[PDB]
Amino acid sequence: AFRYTRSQSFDIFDINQKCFVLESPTQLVALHLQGPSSSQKVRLNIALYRPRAGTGQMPVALGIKGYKLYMSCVMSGTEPTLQLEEADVMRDIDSVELTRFIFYRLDSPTEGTTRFESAAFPGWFICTSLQPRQPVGITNQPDQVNIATYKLSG
């Protein structure tokens, strides 16, 4: 279904200039990182895939750079949930199960912004809260009382 092509490291901020930090090994939070603290900003190692749902094709996996984690979308209880999993780099994504790691990177090239739509959960997008220091999650209402728009730089 998808084969790995290459990775590239990016800084990422949401549209309100919050960055990601790894609050605990299983949870990202978004905050305005500043002042006087030891919290380390997360960079993404974005693995680009080639193919072998409403979805704009640039399928990617999102590695949490330096922490040996990849983002995934999975059912928890009865609700789609963003999680972070210890996973090695995957050459092949060739099952419904492994599709949990794939997002479509949706760039708005003119504006230089990006959204990330789950491949396992089409219609669900990676989002942050309007409030700082809350978990990064997924939503089927992107940018509606949350932020689902990012600016990447590499």
How was this structure determined? It was done by X-ray
At 80, which helix (H) or strand (E)?
Answer: strand 79-86
Tell me if 78 sits within 8 A of 66, measured CB to CB.
Answer: no
- What's the resolution in A? 1.6
Domain ranges, ordered by start, for the chain: 1-154
Which of 65, 37, 57, 72 is CA-nearest to residue 105?
A: 57
What is the SS3 assignment for 98? helix
Cα-Cα-Cα-Cα dihedral of 140, 141, 142, 146, to 10°? -120
94-101, Cβ contacts within 8 angstroms, sequence gap of 24 or more? 94/1, 94/2, 94/52, 95/1, 96/120, 99/1, 100/72, 100/73, 100/74, 101/61, 101/70, 101/71, 101/72
For domain 1-154, which CATH number applies: 2.80.10.50, 2.60.40.10, 1.10.10.350, 3.40.50.300? 2.80.10.50
Give the ranges where 1-154 is alpha helix by DSSP (H).
Answer: none
Q: Retrieve residue 125's tokens.
A: 């997008």
